[PDB]
Design a protein around this nucleic acid. Structure first.
Ligand SMILES: [Mg+2]
Ligand SMILES: [Mg+2]
Ligand SMILES: [Mg+2]
Ligand SMILES: [Mg+2]
Ligand SMILES: [Mg+2]
Ligand SMILES: [Mg+2]
Ligand SMILES: [Mg+2]
Ligand SMILES: [Mg+2]
Ligand SMILES: [Mg+2]
Ligand SMILES: [Mg+2]
Ligand SMILES: [Mg+2]
Ligand SMILES: [Mg+2]
Ligand SMILES: [Mg+2]
Ligand SMILES: [Mg+2]
Ligand SMILES: [Mg+2]
Ligand SMILES: [Mg+2]
Ligand SMILES: [Mg+2]
Ligand SMILES: [Mg+2]
Ligand SMILES: [Mg+2]
Ligand SMILES: [Mg+2]
Ligand SMILES: [Mg+2]
Ligand SMILES: [Mg+2]
Ligand SMILES: [Mg+2]
Ligand SMILES: [Mg+2]
Ligand SMILES: [Mg+2]
Ligand SMILES: [Mg+2]
Ligand SMILES: [Mg+2]
Ligand SMILES: [Mg+2]
Ligand SMILES: [Mg+2]
Ligand SMILES: [Mg+2]
Ligand SMILES: [Mg+2]
Ligand SMILES: [Mg+2]
Ligand SMILES: [Mg+2]
Ligand SMILES: [Mg+2]
Ligand SMILES: [Mg+2]
Ligand SMILES: [Mg+2]
Ligand SMILES: [Mg+2]
Ligand SMILES: [Mg+2]
Ligand SMILES: [Mg+2]
Ligand SMILES: [Mg+2]
Ligand SMILES: [Mg+2]
Ligand SMILES: [Mg+2]
Ligand SMILES: [Mg+2]
Ligand SMILES: [Mg+2]
Ligand SMILES: [Mg+2]
Ligand SMILES: [Mg+2]
Ligand SMILES: [Mg+2]
Ligand SMILES: [Mg+2]
Ligand SMILES: [Mg+2]
Ligand SMILES: [Mg+2]
Ligand SMILES: [Mg+2]
Ligand SMILES: [Mg+2]
Ligand SMILES: [Mg+2]
Ligand SMILES: [Mg+2]
Ligand SMILES: [Mg+2]
Ligand SMILES: [Mg+2]
Ligand SMILES: [Mg+2]
Ligand SMILES: [Mg+2]
Ligand SMILES: [Mg+2]
Ligand SMILES: [Mg+2]
Ligand SMILES: [Mg+2]
Ligand SMILES: [Mg+2]
Ligand SMILES: [Mg+2]
Ligand SMILES: [Mg+2]
Ligand SMILES: [Mg+2]
Ligand SMILES: [Mg+2]
Ligand SMILES: [Mg+2]
Ligand SMILES: [Mg+2]
Ligand SMILES: [Mg+2]
Ligand SMILES: [Mg+2]
Ligand SMILES: [Mg+2]
Ligand SMILES: [Mg+2]
Ligand SMILES: [Mg+2]
Ligand SMILES: [Mg+2]
Ligand SMILES: [Mg+2]
Ligand SMILES: [Mg+2]
Ligand SMILES: [Mg+2]
Ligand SMILES: [Mg+2]
Ligand SMILES: [Mg+2]
Ligand SMILES: [Mg+2]
Ligand SMILES: [Mg+2]
Ligand SMILES: [Mg+2]
Ligand SMILES: [Mg+2]
Ligand SMILES: [Mg+2]
Ligand SMILES: [Mg+2]
Ligand SMILES: [Mg+2]
Ligand SMILES: [Mg+2]
Ligand SMILES: [Mg+2]
Ligand SMILES: [Mg+2]
Ligand SMILES: [Mg+2]
Ligand SMILES: [Mg+2]
Ligand SMILES: [Mg+2]
Ligand SMILES: [Mg+2]
Ligand SMILES: [Mg+2]
Ligand SMILES: [Mg+2]
Ligand SMILES: [Mg+2]
Ligand SMILES: [Mg+2]
Ligand SMILES: [Mg+2]
Ligand SMILES: [Mg+2]
Ligand SMILES: [Mg+2]
Ligand SMILES: [Mg+2]
Ligand SMILES: [Mg+2]
Ligand SMILES: [Mg+2]
Ligand SMILES: [Mg+2]
Ligand SMILES: [Mg+2]
Ligand SMILES: [Mg+2]
Ligand SMILES: [Mg+2]
Ligand SMILES: [Mg+2]
Ligand SMILES: [Mg+2]
Ligand SMILES: [Mg+2]
Ligand SMILES: [Mg+2]
Ligand SMILES: [Mg+2]
Ligand SMILES: [Mg+2]
Ligand SMILES: [Mg+2]
Ligand SMILES: [Mg+2]
Ligand SMILES: [Mg+2]
Ligand SMILES: [Mg+2]
Ligand SMILES: [Mg+2]
Ligand SMILES: [Mg+2]
Ligand SMILES: [Mg+2]
Ligand SMILES: [Mg+2]
Ligand SMILES: [Mg+2]
Ligand SMILES: [Mg+2]
Ligand SMILES: [Mg+2]
Ligand SMILES: [Mg+2]
Ligand SMILES: [Mg+2]
Ligand SMILES: [Mg+2]
Ligand SMILES: [Mg+2]
Ligand SMILES: [Mg+2]
Ligand SMILES: [Mg+2]
Ligand SMILES: [Mg+2]
Ligand SMILES: [Mg+2]
Ligand SMILES: [Mg+2]
Ligand SMILES: [Mg+2]
Ligand SMILES: [Mg+2]
Ligand SMILES: [Mg+2]
Ligand SMILES: [Mg+2]
Ligand SMILES: [Mg+2]
Ligand SMILES: [Mg+2]
Ligand SMILES: [Mg+2]
Ligand SMILES: [Mg+2]
Ligand SMILES: [Mg+2]
Ligand SMILES: [Mg+2]
Ligand SMILES: [Mg+2]
Ligand SMILES: [Mg+2]
Ligand SMILES: [Mg+2]
Ligand SMILES: [Mg+2]
Ligand SMILES: [Mg+2]
Ligand SMILES: [Mg+2]
Ligand SMILES: [Mg+2]
Ligand SMILES: [Mg+2]
Ligand SMILES: [Mg+2]
Ligand SMILES: [Mg+2]
Ligand SMILES: [Mg+2]
Ligand SMILES: [Mg+2]
Ligand SMILES: [Mg+2]
Ligand SMILES: [Mg+2]
Ligand SMILES: [Mg+2]
Ligand SMILES: [Mg+2]
Ligand SMILES: [Mg+2]
Ligand SMILES: [Mg+2]
Ligand SMILES: [Mg+2]
Ligand SMILES: [Mg+2]
Ligand SMILES: [Mg+2]
Ligand SMILES: [Mg+2]
Ligand SMILES: [Mg+2]
Ligand SMILES: [Mg+2]
Ligand SMILES: [Mg+2]
Ligand SMILES: [Mg+2]
Ligand SMILES: [Mg+2]
Ligand SMILES: [Mg+2]
Ligand SMILES: [Mg+2]
Ligand SMILES: [Mg+2]
Ligand SMILES: [Mg+2]
Ligand SMILES: [Mg+2]
Ligand SMILES: [Mg+2]
Ligand SMILES: [Mg+2]
Ligand SMILES: [Mg+2]
Ligand SMILES: [Mg+2]
Ligand SMILES: [Mg+2]
Ligand SMILES: [Mg+2]
Ligand SMILES: [Mg+2]
Ligand SMILES: [Mg+2]
Ligand SMILES: [Mg+2]
Ligand SMILES: [Mg+2]
Ligand SMILES: [Mg+2]
Ligand SMILES: [Mg+2]
Ligand SMILES: [Mg+2]
Ligand SMILES: [Mg+2]
Ligand SMILES: [Mg+2]
Ligand SMILES: [Mg+2]
Ligand SMILES: [Mg+2]
Ligand SMILES: [Mg+2]
Ligand SMILES: [Mg+2]
Lengths: 77, 110, 141, 203, 59
RNA sequence: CUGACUGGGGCCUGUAGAGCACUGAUAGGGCUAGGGGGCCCACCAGCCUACCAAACCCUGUCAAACUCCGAAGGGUCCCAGGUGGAGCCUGGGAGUGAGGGCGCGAGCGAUAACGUCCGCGUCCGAGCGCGGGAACAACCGAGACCGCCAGCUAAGGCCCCCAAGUCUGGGCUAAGUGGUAAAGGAUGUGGCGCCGCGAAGACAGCCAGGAGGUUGGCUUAGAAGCAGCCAUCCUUUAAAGAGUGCGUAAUAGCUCACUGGUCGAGUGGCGCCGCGCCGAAAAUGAUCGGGGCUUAAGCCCAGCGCCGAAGCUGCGGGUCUGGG
RNA sequence: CGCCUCCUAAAAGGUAACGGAGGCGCCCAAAGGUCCCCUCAGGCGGGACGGAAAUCCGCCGGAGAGCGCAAGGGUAGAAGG
RNA sequence: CGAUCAACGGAUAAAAGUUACCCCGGGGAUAACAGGCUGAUCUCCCCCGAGCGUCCACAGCGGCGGGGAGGUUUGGCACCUCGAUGUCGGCUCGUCGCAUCCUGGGGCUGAAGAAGGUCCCAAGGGUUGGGCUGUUCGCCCAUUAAAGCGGCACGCGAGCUG
RNA sequence: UCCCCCGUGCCCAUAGCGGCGUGGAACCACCCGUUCCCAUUCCGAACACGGAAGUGAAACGCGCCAGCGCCGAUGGUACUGGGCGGGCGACCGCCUGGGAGAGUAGGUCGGUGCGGGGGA
């Protein structure tokens, strides 16, 4: 009697890090994710692991464009 | 269900819009060739030029070039210098290349 | 007797028996019905005993519709082992059944026959039951 | 026939209060109106058990109107098997989609041989003028053997009534009966243990 | 207008946020009364601990 | 003044529920490749199947590792209330790193454990201080600075033990049920509902009638209503199933079903609700805490009053903190 | 016994058990950068050898295919060819 | 650049066993006895009525299933006791339960009688001597109205045995 | 400022599939050619150039039709934050606030911004 199971991996702390209306500075990570659940919008970069981040100081805004996906924007201050 | 033409058009246009420049879009019909410089932030055309509108002549290529030149001139008159070339579904070649080269002689920055 | 031909997983976590049945609450095929009055895991063997008794009452004749299915695997640890060392072995299959469900229906048989078979069948099941007959309320669902 | 049922209007009365006092909450509507109503449950039930969704019910409203309606939907309390809400559909002069009773005239051959008529559809969906609602639709099942079957395509339709469901839709069947003789070949029938669908480098 | 709030049932055994609500209202002792401006933020904590409190509208 | 908590507003989410569009499961039917089997054949094609059955379709479902959907809530930021043994910053000193009960959500276990393992909350821990719960860390009430031969309440109580109602009005229960239990069983009792059948005289009783075909058959070895089923056909009838059981070795042998006379008003069957009855066997002496309780001192509904703590009030005092 | 993916996990993050299921300890000189071009699986119909399935033509077909390897997320307006 | 330092935050550059000859410090934080919680397993009692019983479901029986009771079994758990709760069996001495082995009372019987079976009431009393084995249990011999089953820390070692 | 067309966006199927009709003056397409720039793992199909005889057959645009697709109430219910009860349990109810999914009625054969070209 024993189990062939027993393992699991570390949690990765994924998800949105800054929600709409939140003030951010350039470089602030906005979204941590696997693949493109949110796409980079206006003033937003995407790192190699899909991480969304602010390109300029400003305020975050989200946008749902239907079949085009959801978007994170940073609107300048 | 899209076509190679619809995909190609998207694929190049998306990459251009990402840079945030004013977009110099070119349409090339069997007979004519048109051009509008568009602000995608506002979804607005700022300057136009066409063989159709300039009642231009014969050799399509030479004509292209002329509309290119025409475009630039009305353009700098409005303070526009920089812009990004939207070859749309068209290879950068032939009439389009000619359109581009003329807009360049005309001083448009790209 | 009834069991899945195949499954994505060998063992299921147990879950709960809260609420009235999700669906399956109106007569839908035959004339008379056996409805569950209280929740239970009904075992495959119990189901098969209800069925067999019903065909036994009919001798030849009637149609029995079984409307619940045992897809929940039931686990048990080997006798006398202590807690731990992983989940127990599947020993059988149950159908989760909540109050309101029509578990069985009969058709093609007299009224006194449908009543009796359903009663005897009831005695094979570990919950309280109600016999019902098809109404307009059934037909409007 | 065609049945009558006194109806009444409700505003903010709590549905639970209504039900505790014997009244069944409901709503009547069509493209023109939509009104919160209630009926006496014991009165509603008496009508409904004969009327069903098949026959016209006229609503005697307290304002004096008398509206012809079809019951469009009835919500049943799943624990208790009791109606908890009715939808009354207000007929107007357009043709309307609806369910009309089937009558299975005849005694099938398959049944004489010991079979069972599985009345798969006990009624049938149909576009029709309100001014044209048939009491039913006869269907001859006498030619049915175990295990033959009839479809909507085989339905011979009354004047001014058009099928509203695919003709390919089966409506009755004649199936083998339960038989004690089969029990042993069933009770000794060895069944294969369930396969588990492969995960990983397995598939 | 104002809210006269009276603590009438003990918070012992109730969740810490309900204990906090009494504090936001300034209620420390059973039977204590507090007269508070009737604004929406005050009213929200009063409603939070309604099963602990007696409310009466005043002036 | 930034805090817990709260109000408004935006954004994030995939649970409860539900659904079946995906992945899988799924009963039945339809349609229909593929086999099994039976006709007919090896000249290779046919035909029929109450056989197993793919894909598809319809009805009807199932899922922690399914989701076309999808809450309540939760998180976070902005504005605002919030002056609290709040918050934030730097530093000194720790202790703790065996928890536990309970409620809710899961897993494990056996829809076991005073079981186990997580989550949110609580209390005991440290409130084995106080009231209720017979007694009893964690259930209910409630956070004990000191004093009072004063007052009001909380949970729980108000027949005596034992403070306060043998209080008022409506109802049920007859089991000491109350004061430990299930499937299931039952002319318990009260109350609703639905069907039959009846003064074209029902039910009970006092009284008759129950009949031919016909000891019918797929039927064996007896099978004449009364041993399997794939039979319910009729005549005479005022009635009478080719039969509800008792009966035979098979009959024959009796009643019911069902019709006639006497009375003369109800009668038979289903279901639902409340409260009870059985099912109910364990070990030193019993018992609802006890005595005792029956239009209750039990249960349900609606009241008024009181009693009742270390909670709250009054009076006096102490100490610390804030304010004069 | 470390690491990855899913579930448990109670719709933020996190969250245990000798709870339920699988994977890693590599690889690729292109399987990397960029420019340009292209679009799948599958179903039906058609076509020598040729078949359920090789290659070809037609119509339907939004993504169920592909993406080196587990799983999940992602993705053809490409991350696929 | 050299790590299956993979016990993967990696004690040394370098390491296995045995102790019934054993020892100390601790722990009821943790097993074995007993108790406790639980009752899966165990024992007993019911519901259902397929079928058996020549005929006939229910004299005697009860497929497949279903509900419980008990707390004598084997376990699960790890709650008092590891600054000690002596642990099998026997002897002695009882005492209680009743699901009764006998004796008394009774219903049904597929009860002619006698003798049985089966259920119900009943715990007053009774319930033998021997061979084997440490045995409890069990088998066996010879009898009997009968040769009951359980609880009491698997009753009883400050009562004995060992 | 209205009507048609050509570009290019936004809303992200109420915009889609299918059936029917319609348009060539203008524009767009197909079209005519493959010398030339450019091009086919073969192919001037595509991409590309030079053209202007023809045709709106294909494509596209614009209309119409609800068979499919898509959207979708109101009512009621599930579930639930908070507050209460009950059950030995599996579980069950009440108050207050929130409130689905399925389904029913019904809706839909798009709406709109900017710039060009033409017409009134
Ligand atoms: Mg293993
Ligand atoms: Mg595991
Ligand atoms: Mg982690
Ligand atoms: Mg973890
Ligand atoms: Mg993880
Ligand atoms: Mg997120
Ligand atoms: Mg990058
Ligand atoms: Mg990358
Ligand atoms: Mg917005
Ligand atoms: Mg923006
Ligand atoms: Mg079970
Ligand atoms: Mg289990
Ligand atoms: Mg385990
Ligand atoms: Mg198990
Ligand atoms: Mg089982
Ligand atoms: Mg159910
Ligand atoms: Mg039962
Ligand atoms: Mg449905
Ligand atoms: Mg309190
Ligand atoms: Mg307090
Ligand atoms: Mg409390
Ligand atoms: Mg709270
Ligand atoms: Mg106080
Ligand atoms: Mg402030
Ligand atoms: Mg803040
Ligand atoms: Mg704050
Ligand atoms: Mg807030
Ligand atoms: Mg669920
Ligand atoms: Mg599905
Ligand atoms: Mg469907
Ligand atoms: Mg479920
Ligand atoms: Mg899940
Ligand atoms: Mg789910
Ligand atoms: Mg919030
Ligand atoms: Mg918020
Ligand atoms: Mg503030
Ligand atoms: Mg301060
Ligand atoms: Mg403090
Ligand atoms: Mg503090
Ligand atoms: Mg110090
Ligand atoms: Mg320390
Ligand atoms: Mg410590
Ligand atoms: Mg430690
Ligand atoms: Mg610890
Ligand atoms: Mg511990
Ligand atoms: Mg704790
Ligand atoms: Mg803990
Ligand atoms: Mg306790
Ligand atoms: Mg807990
Ligand atoms: Mg509760
Ligand atoms: Mg729990
Ligand atoms: Mg869990
Ligand atoms: Mg579990
Ligand atoms: Mg159990
Ligand atoms: Mg515990
Ligand atoms: Mg527990
Ligand atoms: Mg538990
Ligand atoms: Mg706790
Ligand atoms: Mg301690
Ligand atoms: Mg306390
Ligand atoms: Mg405390
Ligand atoms: Mg103390
Ligand atoms: Mg106490
Ligand atoms: Mg006490
Ligand atoms: Mg007391
Ligand atoms: Mg205490
Ligand atoms: Mg104090
Ligand atoms: Mg008083
Ligand atoms: Mg009180
Ligand atoms: Mg008392
Ligand atoms: Mg007194
Ligand atoms: Mg009195
Ligand atoms: Mg009694
Ligand atoms: Mg009593
Ligand atoms: Mg008693
Ligand atoms: Mg009764
Ligand atoms: Mg009763
Ligand atoms: Mg009893
Ligand atoms: Mg009274
Ligand atoms: Mg007092
Ligand atoms: Mg006092
Ligand atoms: Mg005090
Ligand atoms: Mg004072
Ligand atoms: Mg003081
Ligand atoms: Mg102080
Ligand atoms: Mg590692
Ligand atoms: Mg998680
Ligand atoms: Mg999760
Ligand atoms: Mg999470
Ligand atoms: Mg959560
Ligand atoms: Mg974090
Ligand atoms: Mg392990
Ligand atoms: Mg492994
Ligand atoms: Mg290459
Ligand atoms: Mg690549
Ligand atoms: Mg390359
Ligand atoms: Mg293909
Ligand atoms: Mg082919
Ligand atoms: Mg061939
Ligand atoms: Mg081929
Ligand atoms: Mg894929
Ligand atoms: Mg692999
Ligand atoms: Mg080394
Ligand atoms: Mg280590
Ligand atoms: Mg090491
Ligand atoms: Mg680590
Ligand atoms: Mg070393
Ligand atoms: Mg070394
Ligand atoms: Mg070593
Ligand atoms: Mg070593
Ligand atoms: Mg050694
Ligand atoms: Mg030795
Ligand atoms: Mg030795
Ligand atoms: Mg020695
Ligand atoms: Mg020695
Ligand atoms: Mg020696
Ligand atoms: Mg020694
Ligand atoms: Mg020692
Ligand atoms: Mg212990
Ligand atoms: Mg430990
Ligand atoms: Mg132990
Ligand atoms: Mg021990
Ligand atoms: Mg023990
Ligand atoms: Mg002890
Ligand atoms: Mg038990
Ligand atoms: Mg028990
Ligand atoms: Mg019993
Ligand atoms: Mg027999
Ligand atoms: Mg007999
Ligand atoms: Mg029999
Ligand atoms: Mg019996
Ligand atoms: Mg049995
Ligand atoms: Mg059981
Ligand atoms: Mg048992
Ligand atoms: Mg014991
Ligand atoms: Mg017990
Ligand atoms: Mg044990
Ligand atoms: Mg034990
Ligand atoms: Mg222990
Ligand atoms: Mg423990
Ligand atoms: Mg010890
Ligand atoms: Mg001692
Ligand atoms: Mg000692
Ligand atoms: Mg001792
Ligand atoms: Mg004894
Ligand atoms: Mg007895
Ligand atoms: Mg006797
Ligand atoms: Mg005798
Ligand atoms: Mg004899
Ligand atoms: Mg006897
Ligand atoms: Mg005795
Ligand atoms: Mg005695
Ligand atoms: Mg005795
Ligand atoms: Mg001897
Ligand atoms: Mg001896
Ligand atoms: Mg012996
Ligand atoms: Mg032995
Ligand atoms: Mg004798
Ligand atoms: Mg003896
Ligand atoms: Mg002993
Ligand atoms: Mg024991
Ligand atoms: Mg003994
Ligand atoms: Mg002893
Ligand atoms: Mg001794
Ligand atoms: Mg001894
Ligand atoms: Mg002793
Ligand atoms: Mg001693
Ligand atoms: Mg002694
Ligand atoms: Mg002693
Ligand atoms: Mg002695
Ligand atoms: Mg010795
Ligand atoms: Mg356009
Ligand atoms: Mg437009
Ligand atoms: Mg715009
Ligand atoms: Mg035309
Ligand atoms: Mg067209
Ligand atoms: Mg033209
Ligand atoms: Mg023309
Ligand atoms: Mg050439
Ligand atoms: Mg040339
Ligand atoms: Mg060409
Ligand atoms: Mg030409
Ligand atoms: Mg055309
Ligand atoms: Mg085109
Ligand atoms: Mg809907
Ligand atoms: Mg609604
Ligand atoms: Mg509610
Ligand atoms: Mg709640
Ligand atoms: Mg509400
Ligand atoms: Mg919902
Ligand atoms: Mg809806
Ligand atoms: Mg229309
Ligand atoms: Mg449309
Ligand atoms: Mg315009």
């Amino acid at each position: 009697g024993s189990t062939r199971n027993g393992r699991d991996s570390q949690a990765k702390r994924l998800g949105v890090k800054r929600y709409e209306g939140q003030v951010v500075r350039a470089g602030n990570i906005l979204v941590r994710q696997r693949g493109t659940r949110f796409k980079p919008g206006k003033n937003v970069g995407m790192g190699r692991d899909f991480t969304l981040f602010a390109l300029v100081d400003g305020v975050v805004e989200f946008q749902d464009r239907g079949r085009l996906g959801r978007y994170v924007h940073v609107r300048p201050l | 269900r899209l076509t190679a033409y619809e995909r190609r058009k998207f694929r190049v246009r998306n990459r251009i819009k990402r840079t945030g420049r004013l977009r110099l879009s070119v349409f090339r019909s069997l007979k004519h060739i048109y051009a509008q410089i568009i602000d995608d932030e506002k979804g607005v055309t700022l300057v136009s030029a066409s063989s159709l509108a300039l009642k231009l002549k014969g050799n399509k290529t030479e004509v292209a070039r002329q509309v290119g030149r025409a475009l630039a001139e009305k353009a700098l008159a409005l303070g526009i210098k920089q812009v990004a070339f939207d070859r749309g579904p068209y290879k950068y070649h032939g009439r389009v290349k000619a359109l581009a080269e003329g807009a360049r002689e005309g001083g448009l920055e790209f | 007797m009834l069991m899945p031909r195949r499954m994505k997983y060998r063992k299921q976590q147990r879950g709960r028996l809260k609420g009235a049945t999700k669906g399956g609450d109106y007569v839908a095929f035959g004339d008379y019905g056996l409805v569950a009055l209280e929740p239970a895991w009904i075992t495959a063997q119990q189901i098969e005993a209800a069925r067999v008794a019903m065909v036994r009452h009919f001798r030849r004749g009637g149609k029995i519709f079984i409307r619940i299915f045992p897809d929940k695997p039931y686990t048990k640890k080997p006798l006398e082992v202590r807690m731990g060392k992983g989940k127990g072995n599947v020993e059988g299959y149950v159908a989760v059944v909540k109050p309101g469900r029509v578990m069985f229906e009969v058709a093609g048989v007299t009224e006194e026959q449908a009543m009796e078979a359903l009663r005897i069948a009831g005695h094979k099941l570990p919950i309280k039951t109600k016999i019902v007959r098809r109404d307009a309320y059934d037909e409007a669902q | 026939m065609e049945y009558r049922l006194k109806a009444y209007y409700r505003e903010g009365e709590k549905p639970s209060a209504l039900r505790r006092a014997g009244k069944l909450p409901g709503v009547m509507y069509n493209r023109h109106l939509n009104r919160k109503v209630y009926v006496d449950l014991v009165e509603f039930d008496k009508v409904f058990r004969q009327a069903s969704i098949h026959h016209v019910i006229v609503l005697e409203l307290p304002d004096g109107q008398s509206l012809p309606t079809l019951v469009r939907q009835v919500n049943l309390d799943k624990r208790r098997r009791r109606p908890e809400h009715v939808d009354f559909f207000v007929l107007s002069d357009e043709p309307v989609e609806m369910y009309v009773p089937l009558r299975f005239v005849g005694t099938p051959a398959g049944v004489r041989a010991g079979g069972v008529l599985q009345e798969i559809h006990r009624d049938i969906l149909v576009k029709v003028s309100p001014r044209n609602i048939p009491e039913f639709i006869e269907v001859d099942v006498s030619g049915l053997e175990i295990g033959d079957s009839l479809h909507a395509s085989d339905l011979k339709l009354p004047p001014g009534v058009e099928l509203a469901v695919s003709p390919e839709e089966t409506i009755a069947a004649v199936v083998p009966p339960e038989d004690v003789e089969k029990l042993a070949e069933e009770a000794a029938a060895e069944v294969a243990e369930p396969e588990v669908i492969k995960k990983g480098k397995e598939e | 207008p104002r809210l006269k709030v009276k603590l009438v049932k003990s918070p012992i055994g109730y969740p810490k946020d309900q204990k906090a609500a009494l504090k936001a209202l300034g209620l420390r002792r059973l039977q204590q009364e507090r007269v508070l401006e009737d604004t929406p933020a005050i009213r929200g904590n009063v409603e939070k601990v309604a099963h602990l409190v007696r409310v009466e509208v005043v002036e």
